[PDB]
Amino acid sequence: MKTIDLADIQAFLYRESRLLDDKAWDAWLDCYRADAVFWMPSWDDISLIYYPNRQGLEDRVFRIKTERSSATVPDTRTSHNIANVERESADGDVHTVRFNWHTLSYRYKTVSSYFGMSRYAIDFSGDAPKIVSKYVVLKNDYLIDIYHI
Amino acid sequence: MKTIDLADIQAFLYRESRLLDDKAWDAWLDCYRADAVFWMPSWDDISLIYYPNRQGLEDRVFRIKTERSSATVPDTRTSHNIANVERESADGDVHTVRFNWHTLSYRYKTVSSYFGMSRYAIDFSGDAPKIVSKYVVLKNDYLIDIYHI
Amino acid sequence: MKTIDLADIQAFLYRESRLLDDKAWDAWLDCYRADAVFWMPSWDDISLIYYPNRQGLEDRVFRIKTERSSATVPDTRTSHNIANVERESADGDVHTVRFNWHTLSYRYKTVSSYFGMSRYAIDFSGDAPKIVSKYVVLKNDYLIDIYHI
């Protein structure tokens, strides 16, 4: 049995979000299982982002790399802040947690905040954890990319 | 003996604040002992909120429900972020902790931040924890309701 | 052997930052080894702060005390929020960690945010932990003092 606790899960969440903040896009993608679903719903009061597997995320990372390859200073500096992590369930080595988050983002003169809640299912059966499903609720919805969430 | 550690306390703090963010007002009230004191002092440089028992909080929740029962979209979305949790004392099954917090709030176009420190005494003697005392220092004091703190 | 885990490190980080938020300047200085190096680099796209030992920090605390000794209300209220703490290495009783942070600051009408990442090396060999090295990356760099970071 793999014994996985909240601290193990938090360590993974901190690493995953660090890989975005540090623009380590390939390492970041490797935190996701090839069959990972990634879903940020719209508020109907149609998703903001939906990918049924990781390929969609790979393509989006390709777009980000392409945009950045021409781009000059100032860059966008981001800082993820993962809070209030609660374990919801475990099914074998697949662990489901929810958490609140607040990403601060800065380029040049202006700071932007994005905040909300996320639910992750994470497969700990391999030597490195792998996200099986990501669900993101953006609360300040009225652009946003994957490196903000 | 109930052995209660910081993680158990954090789990409770995350749940309590989640019940506000998710507008689960009755479940939220049940995190508080009937004799709970709830105090957010004013800065004299008279409280912003004071209740000597839970009844005052029940009445305030009634007011919130009444306001919401007519209200249309956009709603106010809140996100609590509990940080820097330190245990201060334990007396039997009553555990006292302090922590910093930052609630982000959004309706329509504008994000609001509230931040400060809180001290909780929490009774873990029952099957579910119960807040015995809540003290809240709002640092950006110059409105605010119970779902922001 | 001193067994030190992430929770022990977090407890220390929370205390150290609390001593700044509560303006306990002498107690704060005592979280730092006399030979502590404190470095907040500039972005070259020359540091914002560099001290090769604690004396520089002592002198800066003296300046802060002098400024405050004449100053009237409203004061500046600060609130540190330490997030995403990851242990990087241990060498004997010296433990190195990185973390993200967001300090909120308020005086009078306006809230200011400072955010970024920090790396600490902390010596746990004595009865009280002592910072041996502090490195701070301020992401929203375009004033700031030691009580903001």
- Parse chain C into domains and list their residue ranges: 2-149
User: Is CATH 3.10.450.50 the right assignment for the domain spanning B2-149?
Assistant: yes
Instruction: Answer whether the bond into residue B74 is a cis peptide, omega within 30°.
Output: yes
Pairing of strands C32-41, C130-138: parallel
Please check whether residue B83 is in contact with residue A100, taking contact to mean a CB–CB distance below 8 angstroms: no
How far is it, in rounded angstroms, from Cα B21 to Cα B17? Answer: 6
Query: In degrees rounded to 5, what are phi and psi of residue B140?
Result: -100, 75
Residues of C in contact with B139 (CB under 8 A): 77-79, 104, 106
B18 in contact with chain A, both atoms CB, cutoff 8 A: yes
Cα distances from B145 to residues B45, B49, C77, C105, C116, in angstroms, run: 22, 9, 21, 21, 30
Cis peptide before C52 (omega within 30 of 0): no
CA distance C14 to C120: 13
Residue B4 sits at the chain C interface (C-beta within 8 Å)? no
Tokens in use for A4?
């996985």
Report CB contact under 8 Å: C45, A7.
Answer: no
Interchain CB contact of B42 with C (< 8 Å): no
Inter-chain Cβ pairs, chain B and chain C, closer than 8 A: 49
Experiment used for this model: X-ray
Yes or no, beta carbons of C102 and B102 under 8 Å apart: yes
Q: Which residues contact A3 (CB under 8 A, 6 or more apart)?
A: none
CA distance A12 to chain C (A): 10
CB contact under 8 A, A142 and B82: no
Asked if residues A15 and A31 have their Cβ atoms less than 8 Å apart, the reply is yes
The rounded distance, in Å, linking the Cα atoms of A54 and A39 is 11
| C44 touches A at CB < 8 Å | no
H or E segment at A68? helix A54-70
- What are the distances in angstroms from CA B68 to CA B65, B102, B110? 5, 23, 19
Handedness of CA B3, B129, B131, B84 (dihedral sign): positive
Give residue for tokens 């909240």. A6
Name the residue among B86, B117, B142 with its Cβ closest to that of C79. Answer: B117
A81: contact with C, CB 8 A cutoff: yes
Rounded CA-CA distance B21/B78 in Å is 5
The structure was resolved to a resolution in Å of: 1.9
Put simply, the answer to whether A86 touches B14 (Cβ < 8 Å) is yes
Q: Which residues of C126-142 are buried (b: 16+ CB within 10 A; e: fewer)?
A: eeebbbbbbebbbbbbe
